[PDB]
Write a protein that binds this DNA or RNA. Structure first.
Ligand code: K
Ligand code: K
Ligand code: K
Ligand code: K
Ligand code: K
Ligand code: MG
Ligand code: MG
Ligand code: MG
Ligand code: MG
Ligand code: MG
Ligand code: MG
Ligand code: MG
Ligand code: MG
Ligand code: MG
Ligand code: MG
Ligand code: MG
Ligand code: MG
Ligand code: MG
Ligand code: MG
Ligand code: MG
Ligand code: MG
Ligand code: MG
Ligand code: MG
Ligand code: MG
Lengths: 127, 83, 101, 206, 151, 99
RNA sequence: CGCGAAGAACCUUACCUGGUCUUGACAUCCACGGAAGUUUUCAGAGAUGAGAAUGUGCCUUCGGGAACCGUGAGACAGGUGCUGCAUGGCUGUCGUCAGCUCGUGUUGUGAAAUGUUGGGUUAAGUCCCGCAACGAGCGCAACCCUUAUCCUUUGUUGCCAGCGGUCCGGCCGGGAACUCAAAGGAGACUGCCAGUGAUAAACUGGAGGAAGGUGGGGAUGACGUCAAGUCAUCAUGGCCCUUACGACCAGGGCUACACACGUGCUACAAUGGCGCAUACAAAGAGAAGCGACCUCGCGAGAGCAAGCGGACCUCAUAAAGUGCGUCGUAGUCCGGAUUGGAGUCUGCAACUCGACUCCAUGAAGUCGGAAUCGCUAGUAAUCGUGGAUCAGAAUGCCACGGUG
RNA sequence: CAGAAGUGUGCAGC
């Protein structure tokens, strides 16, 4: 049966199902290499399975929604790490050291009245 | 410019006067405030005293003027150098 | 606002309902018409200019209901930014309260 | 500097709204306008009947108005003959059929609106403002407020230059959102002009 | 800051060569957050430098950076009525930061037909102990030794 | 056929007790009910300058939250639809019904 | 100094020229005659004048009364006229700085002092010891909203793990798993463990956890200073006008142009321009509305017309990006001001003075003197999207998400 | 090590 993890990052959310199998990865019915064109995403999606050293022993089915490229990549990494901790809880102490278990909370800071941006203040002049 | 679907614009209260002025032969200059009215061909050879905000300015309708608005010939602001 | 401005505005609002709300056909059906003869369209164009000018809805200012202020009007409430806040903090508006996020 | 209006910041936390009805944007403004008209009328009408508060509710395409007053018998009228006039004129103003309810404010000395109006009336009676303020504070405290403060502003005593004068007793924690701070304002139209009276009454937290 | 001291933010190593130093270099060459553009430029420059040098990419980059990292810098020190330039032993992390900044800003102002090629040329010159990044390092050392009297 | 009720209010507790009354009276009347669904809370934001003059940067920001609830009567027998027509609610609730 | 103004073609409008009225455009009272009103003409720029053609609510306890209209006399209306240095209310600022005070006691002839100072500590008059002080109040902190983790409940208009069907479309039967919607609850407390410290308060490091020391952000602004801002939002004392500083109307102006300054937008290019293909958002609005599909047009748009008071329909194919080609350091295939020509749309009406589309034209500008400004992390930078005001009319303002 | 000047005149808080 499927082992499950929800993960999320910025506005992106991902559902990850993992199962024993020959290393297949599918995201939104697309190959990893087809869905992501940027090497950073292709690396971060592997990072946890690389460190666990199971890339050739597990396969996973993923769907991901919301946010852009890196948001979804991080959301997938987070879901993968949760699901594989459900698969083998003994790995948690390792993943804690890897830093993946922390749900990255850096949301976008809302604009504030009187400021052009989150913090960019208008140009000031003495006179 | 006005949508080509609608055709050019003239004020009725001006047209009623253009009519009798053409019948009379522009016997006297036709005062008007309809600066927005278009110059129609029937107006050629008339003199219209178009309001400018404080005076009526005589415009003599030359054939070249057709299709312009009357107000284009009555400047509204006075400038003559700063010094 | 000067009381005359209030009388003038309500006069315009009333007058607009006596004509264009009914005779809008004259423009929307005829002066805008393509399927019909240009002579009728021309006659309608000329006729529309005979309606009292203040009957056009485009001439309504849309003032604040409680003080007649023209600027800073809010269409949800019918009030200026001033009177809306005065009523708001006194709790006269049935669901409005200060936001935070 | 300036302070937030202490009622509005507490709306929904501890203070309820004085109007309660749901409306779509189409009729919202007309409801708000007719509510304003009825409030203005009732305030002008009952000016001596110590009306503390007016709550307007619009159920079932009807209006019902609850009036909180420290002098109910004057508002009701003998045999209720007066509420008939109020409800009929309110039905005229709102157009929808009207119902009126009246509620006693048992202790007007603990009501910021009635205290503010009392001080205002006394000022227009040419009472010394110090005495009016002191009397108000002392009565509120002896009747069991957890605290009070009062303020009066502008051309006090006909002075040529305006002042603000304020007096405080007990505890009055305006930054505490749990605090049920009652608050109100009134204005005295003396021969010298407008004197502004503000009243805060603290009745305990939560 | 005057109250705090800050712990360093977590960096991610370069995905192709595994180097945090190359990651910092990319982050310095990056403009407007166009990370992937900078990555492409850096990879092209490194591969062309590699084939020029007969070296691995990181090896050529390291030997270039060795030639430009400064050993000392000049710092303004206040005295009760004067200010003196005084040489200070710059620490290694700031050495790397300075060397990368100097390489990047030197390349940026070259005339060559593309940023990747400008960069490759500047790294070659640096490895060859020549050019603008090296003269920058040099004159920094000159100034330090000229101020050595106050150290 | 089903009947479907949408409740709107400016108070989630008032809307809550309204839905509770609906569900309890309906099931007491033998209705089959598919339970109250919370639809997304449409909210309006306003910004106003609070000075009578100038001071463009001095502003207050306000919101109105409209709470929604959906409930479906999936077997509306005559007595159930009658009872649901008989209920009255506080004016803070708008009830809109469909068949 | 993109400030009131969250939006000046008419209106707005308060200004100018001219034309008009005088108990008045807006209110109450009083007397007289009439329902109100509708359809229509001739004058005039229009205001306003004239004149025709049409029309009777409710008791009438019949005298009229209820609306509205006109007329007529006075009280009176009206004033965006002056005083913000006569005021209320509201707002800016020092400043979200950590301060500011009072009761009783005590000290001093007294103004006053102590407390509130001292040793540590904190974001903090935060906390602990000491001390003629002992207590308290307004401030700090907390309560409030939002965000980062989990759990219960409900499960359509939202979802699709696992099952049958499939036209390959969650689209079908179906499931309530998952995302999500949103009501309720849990969690963070220096709570736990070493070390330092004055057997103190608290500091350093560690465990666990989604989060660690105010976890991030917002709201919240003490006593008071600046005779700070507003009599033009409004209210108001005093003063001034009352055939005019009041009222109606058309046209014009607020959009001028020798110049000087502030805040922004677009650029000077290759970390780029152009062309073709193709990925990944959030948050809002919609009935005098948002407007699909389809047909027509190079385009702005036009015709027809579905749906939606909306987790359903429309606004609406996000752009940066990724792949491929081309340009070759050029005042250029950079830049797109200016100006001619032809059009669309809103509107009684785009001359003064709107927006946008097409064709053509193709300035200055090659990183900016003295000087000066913002920002400490999902920040700066950079790229798109929405909304209010609004018939039409953002490079401004208020919000959202992507890369970072 | 250098760094000068700031017109006259008023009114509440008893
Ligand atoms: K003031
Ligand atoms: K004392
Ligand atoms: K005044
Ligand atoms: K601009
Ligand atoms: K618009
Ligand atoms: Mg400034
Ligand atoms: Mg308008
Ligand atoms: Mg600004
Ligand atoms: Mg004008
Ligand atoms: Mg002034
Ligand atoms: Mg002190
Ligand atoms: Mg101390
Ligand atoms: Mg304290
Ligand atoms: Mg002490
Ligand atoms: Mg606080
Ligand atoms: Mg002043
Ligand atoms: Mg003025
Ligand atoms: Mg005018
Ligand atoms: Mg202007
Ligand atoms: Mg060049
Ligand atoms: Mg900071
Ligand atoms: Mg952003
Ligand atoms: Mg001198
Ligand atoms: Mg002096």
């Amino acid at each position: 049966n499927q082992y499950y993890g929800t993960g999320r990052r910025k506005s992106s959310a991902a559902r990850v199902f993992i199962k024993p199998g020959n290393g297949k990865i599918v995201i939104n019915q697309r190959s990893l290499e087809q869905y992501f064109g940027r090497e950073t995403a292709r690396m971060v999606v592997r990072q946890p399975l690389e460190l666990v050293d199971m890339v050739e022993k597990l396969d996973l089915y993923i769907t991901v929604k919301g946010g852009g490229i890196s948001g979804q990549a991080g959301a997938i990494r987070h879901g993968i790490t949760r699901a594989l901790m459900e698969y083998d809880e003994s790995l948690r102490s390792e993943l804690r050291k890897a830093g993946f278990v922390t749900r990255d909370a850096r949301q976008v800071e809302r604009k504030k009245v009187g400021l052009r941006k989150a913090r960019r203040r208008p140009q000031f002049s003495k006179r | 410019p006005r949508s080509l679907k609608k055709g050019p614009f003239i004020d009725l209260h001006l047209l009623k006067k253009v009519e009798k002025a053409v019948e009379s032969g522009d016997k006297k200059p036709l005062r008007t405030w309809s600066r927005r009215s278009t110059i129609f061909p029937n107006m050629i050879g008339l003199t219209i005293a178009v309001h400018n905000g404080r005076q009526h300015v005589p415009v003599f309708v030359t054939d070249e003027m057709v299709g312009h608005k009357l107000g284009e010939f009555a400047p509204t602001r006075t400038y003559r150098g700063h010094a | 606002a000067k009381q005359s401005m209030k009388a003038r505005e309500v006069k315009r609002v009333a007058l607009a309902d006596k004509y264009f709300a009914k005779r809008a056909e004259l423009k929307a059906i005829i002066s805008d018409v393509n399927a019909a003869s240009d002579e009728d369209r021309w006659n309608a164009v000329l006729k529309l200019q005979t309606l009292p000018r203040d009957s056009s809805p485009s001439r309504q200012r849309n003032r604040c209901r409680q003080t007649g202020r023209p600027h800073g009007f809010l269409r949800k409430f019918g009030l200026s930014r001033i009177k809306v806040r005065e009523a708001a903090m006194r709790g006269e508006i049935p669901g409005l309260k200060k936001a935070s996020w | 500097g300036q302070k937030v209006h202490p009622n509005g910041i507490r709306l929904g936390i501890v203070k309820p709204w004085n109007s309660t009805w749901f409306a779509n944007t189409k009729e919202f403004a007309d409801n708000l306008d007719s509510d304003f008209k009825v409030r203005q009328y009732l305030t002008k009408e009952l000016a001596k009947a110590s009306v503390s508060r007016i709550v307007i509710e619009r159920p079932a395409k009807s209006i019902r108005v609850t009036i909180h007053t420290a002098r109910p018998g004057i508002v009701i009228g003998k045999k209720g003959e007066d509420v008939e006039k109020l409800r009929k004129v309110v039905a005229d103003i709102a157009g929808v059929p009207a119902q009126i309810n009246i509620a006693e404010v048992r202790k007007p000395e603990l009501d910021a609106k009635l205290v503010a109006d009392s001080i205002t009336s006394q000022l227009e009676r040419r009472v010394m403002f110090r005495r009016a303020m002191k009397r108000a504070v002392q009565n509120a405290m002896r009747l069991g407020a957890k605290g009070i403060k009062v303020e009066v502003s502008g051309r006090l005593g006909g002075a040529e230059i305006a002042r603000t004068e304020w007096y405080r007793e007990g505890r009055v924690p305006l930054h505490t959102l749990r605090a049920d701070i009652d608050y109100n304002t009134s204005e005295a139209h003396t021969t010298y002009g407008v004197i502004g009276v503000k009243v805060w009454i603290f009745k305990g937290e939560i | 800051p005057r109250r705090r001291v800050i712990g360093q933010r977590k960096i991610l190593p370069d995905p192709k060569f595994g180097s945090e130093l190359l990651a910092k270099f990319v982050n310095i060459l990056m403009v407007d957050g166009k990370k992937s553009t900078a990555e492409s430029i850096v990879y092209s420059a490194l591969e062309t430098l590699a084939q020029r040098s007969g070296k691995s990419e990181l090896e050529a980059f390291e030997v270039a950076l060795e030639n430009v990292r400064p050993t000392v810098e000049v710092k303004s020190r206040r005295v009760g009525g004067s200010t003196y330039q005084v040489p200070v032993e710059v620490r290694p992390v700031r050495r790397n930061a300075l060397a990368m900044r100097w390489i990047v800003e030197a390349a940026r102002k070259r005339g060559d037909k593309s940023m990747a090629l400008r960069l490759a040329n500047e790294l070659s010159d640096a490895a060859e102990n020549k050019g603008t990044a090296v003269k920058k390092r040099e004159d920094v050392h000159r100034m330090a030794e000229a101020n050595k009297a106050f150290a | 056929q089903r009947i479907r009720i949408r409740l709107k209010a400016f108070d989630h507790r008032l809307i809550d007790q309204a839905t509770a009354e609906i569900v309890e009276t309906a099931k007491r009347t033998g209705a089959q009910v598919r339970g109250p669904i919370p639809l997304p809370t449409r909210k309006e934001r306003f910004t106003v300058l609070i000075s009578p003059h100038v001071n463009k940067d001095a502003r207050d920001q306000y919101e109105i939250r409209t709470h929604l609830r959906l409930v479906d009567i999936v077997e509306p027998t005559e007595k159930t639809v009658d009872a649901l027509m008989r209920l009255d609610l506080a004016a803070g609730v708008d009830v809109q019904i469909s068949l």
